[PDB]
Design a protein around this ligand. Structure first.
Ligand SMILES: *[C@@H]1O[C@H](CO)[C@@H](O[C@@H]2O[C@H](CO)[C@@H](O)[C@H](O)[C@H]2NC(C)=O)[C@H](O)[C@H]1NC(C)=O
Ligand SMILES: O=P(O)(O)OC[C@H]1O[C@H](O)[C@@H](O)[C@@H](O)[C@@H]1O
Ligand SMILES: O=P(O)(O)OC[C@H]1O[C@H](O)[C@@H](O)[C@@H](O)[C@@H]1O
Ligand SMILES: CC(=O)N[C@@H]1[C@@H](O)[C@H](O)[C@@H](CO)O[C@H]1O
Ligand SMILES: [Os+3]
Ligand SMILES: [Os+3]
Lengths: 416, 417
């Protein structure tokens, strides 16, 4: 009944500019009693250290893409508004803005898709705010197909895990993973046999300023011991190349795993809403702006596919005439019928990210696919000092997965 | 190469408007003199009884969906054949001739991007008569399944397809899936399936109004109960002197693995007797009067709801839904999960109203291409019903799609003979 997969948790959102923290319960039976037993959206004014409800559970209004919460509290009537968009993970509600009387939020989540195919058998909140109200988000690590191989000295066994959810085994990239039990968050393969050594229960936990842990709980070798998996994610003090998660203890079906990943650091250290990252904020100086101008005759790049042609103009770059009406960072054109023009990403919706050695430029807000998923494009930039076009290089379409378009782009401007 | 399955035959086309009969052979190896061994398009002038080539097979320029042939002659003479993906081998339709340049359009399976529409073996399925009137059996060709022939025999089941093999691999009926691949005629005598006839020669016009199709099965492996005889199937299609309900093919002889089948069908009659390019049929030309114009205070378009799409029909001059008021179509498809997707499933200028074997059918074609290359097409199966809602006008009921060909049922008082 209305996003069932989000109802058993208390979700947090913050308004950084005003130091306001929001506690959200889509089924507000809860406990945020801090605002009362009926409050669905509880606001903590950290300034005066006080709580005020800005959305009551009973005064709810629901539709496929919009949840509204009202109050009887007069305003200089206060209410909350949550715009839902289909996403490929449970996601997190993002604070958009707060007008005089209304508090707006946006939530990209698998629980808002037109098709159930995007919904995981079991997924839990995958983020947490630290003492400073900075978000540590692991959603980027969540696999929708397959899982991660854990490093261990046991050559006759493979340990597979996913993050914050079960491992999708039916379409797994690895043949081994495909032999795993359905619904398992951690799977152990031995002698062509796979065991379910841990399933998703509670959301991600933040223990140390720079440490997050995820616990999975549920076989011969267990000798009377319920299998358990505990992953500890650590934000390193210095930027380094990505590392595989490592096994630190396999004491009788009681697995301990440490994963050094910059995704465990606060998010603003990894991302920018513009085409540049700075040493001061991200410990890396990047500026892809010099790419918006290809200058010559076409300030847009083109990337050929089997059935389509992609036209890209990034960082405010000018677009091509065939898309001179859609306002698109990335524009997909059907070859058989050059009249079908789909937007695969918009310029106002850019996220430049650097984490674990990878520089990624993500454009979202594209036209929706039947699943309800706004088409989006992610560009995996690669450093190349000698890239053609004086180092600017050129994007290569590498493929599509359910309306997310992938490109690779070798360029000197992606060299840290 | 160049459409390999078209070269095995010589295809006729006609310009009745000028009494011209063309012999087409994409590979030029036709032999028929009066125009040469290299002539790809030979034009027999019936008014003078002379032949002149309008296209030489050697002077060929090929494009994706276009074949052109130049000759040595040259007025102040050449040929062009436009190819469009079709679901049967079809026929090269003469469209017009200019200042010594003859045009043709050919909707055929041999021009489909996705070779999923090609049969294991298909042959020409039409023939022109002395009056240059066409007798086309293409509509009876099944891209899936077969026709169960009426034999009255209790021990056997005899299945056939028209001008082509029965698609066994992906057929619904379990009994047909037991038939050998490539068989055009399948005999089930003993819970066993036998191939007693494969296609080879095209449709032949015997009686100036009688069509004959001959399937042969020569060589070793003849069934033991056939006694040194090679199986063979011979179907005679006969045009009824008067309109009547379509009948089933009838087995009229079954000597030694030799089958003689008679099929009384109005599809055997000249085409202009079964079809019109407008929404009306006359008693004089069609032997039946029909006018669907009246179906053309509220919305001037019809709507048929489907699971994933909505279909808007603008019939006989009617007007489309404002949502499709950006192209031009008689049938327009719009995806519900994304109203931005508007596809033309048929165009007003491409309509065929047909009456044959008791069924009244309105067809719109020229729709937008699918990845296969097939232009979308809508076929509206009309039914008689005096007590039809909307004051008899009734309304279209979408009944399903099949590879970019959309079907509809339409009960209306205007569909009554
Ligand atoms: C929410 O408060 C508003 C104000 O009285 C009520 O009216 C509108 O309700 C719709 C949906 O219910 C909202 O989309 C509008 O924004 C509301 N109007 C505005 C702008 O105030 C609404 O009835 C209240 N919700 C309840 C208690 O049902
Ligand atoms: O929304 P649908 O019907 O699932 O179609 C989705 C498809 O739409 C268009 O054809 C293109 O954008 C494809 O890349 C995309 O995958
Ligand atoms: O050309 P494609 O990629 O095979 O798609 C064909 C399909 O396109 C759209 O989704 C609709 O028109 C369907 O009815 C049609 O079958
Ligand atoms: C043979 C036939 O009916 N096809 C017609 C074609 O002649 C016409 O050009 C087109 C619209 O331009 O509509 C369709
Ligand atoms: Os073990
Ligand atoms: Os017999």
């Amino acid at each position: 009944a209305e996003f069932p997969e989000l109802c058993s948790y208390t979700w947090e959102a913050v308004d950084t500019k005003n130091n306001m923290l929001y506690k959200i319960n889509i089924c507000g039976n809860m406990g945020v009693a801090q605002c009362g037993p009926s409050s669905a959206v509880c606001m903590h004014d950290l300034k005066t250290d006080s709580f005020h409800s800005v959305g009551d559970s009973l005064l709810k209004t629901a539709s496929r893409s919009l949840l509204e919460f009202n109050t009887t509290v007069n305003c200089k009537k206060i209410q909350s508004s949550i715009t839902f968009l289909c996403g490929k993970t449970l996601g997190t509600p993002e604070f958009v803005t707060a007008t005089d009387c209304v508090h707006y939020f946006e939530w990209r989540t698998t629980a808002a898709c037109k098709k159930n195919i995007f919904k995981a058998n079991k997924e839990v909140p995958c983020y947490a705010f630290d003492r400073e109200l900075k978000k540590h988000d692991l959603n980027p690590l969540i696999k929708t197909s397959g899982a991660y191989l854990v490093d261990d000295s046991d050559p006759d066994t493979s340990l597979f895990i996913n993050v914050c959810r079960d491992i999708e085994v039916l379409r797994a990239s690895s043949p081994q993973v495909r032999v795993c039990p359905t619904g398992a968050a951690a799977c152990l393969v031995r002698g062509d046999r796979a065991f379910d050594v841990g399933r998703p229960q509670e959301g991600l936990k933040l223990v140390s300023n720079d440490r997050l842990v995820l616990s999975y709980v549920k076989p011969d070798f267990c000798d009377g011991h319920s299998p358990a998996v505990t992953i500890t994610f650590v934000c390193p003090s210095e930027r380094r190349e990505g590392t595989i998660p490592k096994l630190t203890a396999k004491s009788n079906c009681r697995f301990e795993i440490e994963w050094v990943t910059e995704y465990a650091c606060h998010r603003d250290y990894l991302e920018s809403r513009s085409c540049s990252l700075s040493s001061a904020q991200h410990d890396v100086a990047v500026d892809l702006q010099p790419l918006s101008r290809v200058a010559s005759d076409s300030l847009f790049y083109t990337s050929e596919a089997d059935e389509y042609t992609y036209y890209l103009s990034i960082c405010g770059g000018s677009q091509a005439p065939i898309c001179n009406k859609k306002d698109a960072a990335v524009c997909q054109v059907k070859k058989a019928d050059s009249t079908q023009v789909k937007v695969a990403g918009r310029p106002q919706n850019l996220t430049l990210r650097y984490s674990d050695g990878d520089l990624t430029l993500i454009y979202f807000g594209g036209e929706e696919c039947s699943s309800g998923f706004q088409r989006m494009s992610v560009i995996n930039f690669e450093c190349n000092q000698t890239a053609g076009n004086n180092g600017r290089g050129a994007p290569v379409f590498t493929g599509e997965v359910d309306c997310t378009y992938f490109f690779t782009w070798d360029t000197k401007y992606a060299c840290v």
